[PDB]
C-alpha cells in the first residue's frame, strides 16, 4: 500500500546518526558539527538540542526505558544525556579512535560500540558503565553493530575488512565470519526482524547490497542500482520492503520478495548517511533529514 507522504523535513548540518523514539513522536539526529537534535516531527518543534562536542557525532540512540540518549563522537567519547532534564549522566572515553556505531540491547542494560580501533566494546550501564568485554578479530574499521532481535545474546559487526562477524556475548571469538565478497568493505549490517527468515543484509562502498542466510552463510540476493557508496540497507520491520540510502543522494525501496527496486527517491538533501524505522522512516543527509510515512 505504498503512499510515500512527506511528514517532516528540516535543513541542518550533515546528519550522521538518526533514531526514532518508540512511544513519543520524536526523532534524534546526530550531526557532523557535534550538535544533536531531538525533534517532535508531528508538531515540528525541537524538544531538546545539544552542542555535545566540536567533532562529528556519528552514532546516537534513544534508550527509552531510561529516558536517555546515548551518543558517540570522533573525540573518542560516549556521552549519555537524560532528554527530560537535559543533564549529562555519563561521559567517558570509549575507544582510542572514532566511534562509528552504537547498538542498545532490547532488554538487558548493554550498549555496543564499534570503532576504528578495530573492536566492538560492551558497556553495562547497571555496572557503572563498565567495559565488560572487547570483541577482537576485525582487521579494519568496525562500521556497524546490531543485535539479533530474535536472539540478542548474539550480534553482528560490519567492517571495512570486508567481513561480517557474528558474536555471542561472553564469548571471545566469532560464532562465524561472513566473507561478503564486498571487497571495498561493509558499511552497514541489519537483521530481518521476523522469525520466518534467518536473514542479514549488508551495504558496501562497492555499490552492492547483499542478503545473507545466517544459518548457511549463503548469499540469497545481490541488490544493484546505487551509483555511489551505499551507507545503509535495512529490512522494514512491518512492510515487505528493504530500504537503502547512498552517497549518490537517493533512497531506494526494494521488494523484499523479488529483490527488485520499487521506488527511487532523491529527497534533495545530497548524500544519504543513516536510516531509522519506527510506517514512519527517517534518513539523515548532508543537508538535513526527512521523516517519511509510507502508509
Amino acid at each position: 500500500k505504498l503512499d510515500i507522504k512527506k511528514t517532516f523535513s528540516n535543513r541542518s548540518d550533515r546528519v550522521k546518526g538518526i533514531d526514532f523514539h518508540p512511544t513519543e513522536p520524536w526523532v534524534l539526529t546526530t550531526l557532523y558539527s557535534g550538535r544533536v537534535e531531538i525533534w517532535n516531527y508531528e508538531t515540528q518543534v525541537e524538544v531538546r538540542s545539544i552542542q555535545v562536542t566540536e567533532t562529528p557525532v556519528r552514532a546516537g540512540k534513544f534508550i527509552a526505558r531510561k529516558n536517555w540518549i546515548i551518543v558517540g563522537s570522533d573525540d573518542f567519547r560516549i556521552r549519555v544525556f537524560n532528554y527530560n532534564t537535559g543533564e549529562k549522566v555519563v561521559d567517558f572515553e570509549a575507544h582510542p579512535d572514532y566511534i562509528r556505531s552504537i547498538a542498545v540491547h532490547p532488554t538487558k542494560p548493554y550498549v555496543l560500540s564499534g570503532s576504528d580501533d578495530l573492536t566492538v566494546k560492551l558497556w553495562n550501564w547497571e555496572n557503572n558503565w563498565a567495559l565488560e568485554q572487547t570483541f577482537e578479530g576485525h582487521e579494519h574499521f568496525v562500521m556497524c553493530v546490531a543485535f539479533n532481535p530474535k536472539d540478542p545474546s548474539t550480534f553482528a559487526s560490519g567492517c571495512l575488512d570486508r567481513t561480517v562477524k557474528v558474536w555471542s556475548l561472553g564469548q571471545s571469538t566469532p560464532n562465524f565470519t561472513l566473507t561478503t565478497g564486498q571487497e571495498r568493505g561493509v558499511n552497514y549490517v541489519d537483521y530481518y526482524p521476523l522469525p520466518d527468515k534467518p536473514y542479514m543484509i549488508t551495504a558496501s562502498d562497492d555499490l552492492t547490497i547483499k542478503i545473507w542466510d545466517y544459518q548457511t552463510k549463503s548469499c540469497v540476493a545481490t541488490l544493484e542500482g546505487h551509483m555511489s557508496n551505499v551507507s545503509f540497507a535495512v529490512f522494514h520491520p512491518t512492510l515487505p520492503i528493504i530500504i537503502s540510502g547512498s552517497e549518490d543522494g537517493t533512497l531506494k525501496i526494494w521488494n523484499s520478495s523479488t529483490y527488485k527496486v520499487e521506488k527511487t527517491l532523491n529527497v534533495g538533501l545530497e548524500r544519504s548517511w543513516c536510516i531509522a524505522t519506527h510506517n514512519y522512516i527517517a534518513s539523515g543527509f548532508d543537508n538535513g533529514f526527512t521523516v517519511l510515512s509510507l502508509g
Binding site: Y98, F141, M143, L160, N187, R271
Partner: peptide
C-alpha cells in the same frame, strides 16, 4: 589517512 572521514 582516515577512510570514511566524511
Amino acid at each position: 589517512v582516515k577512510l570514511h572521514y566524511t
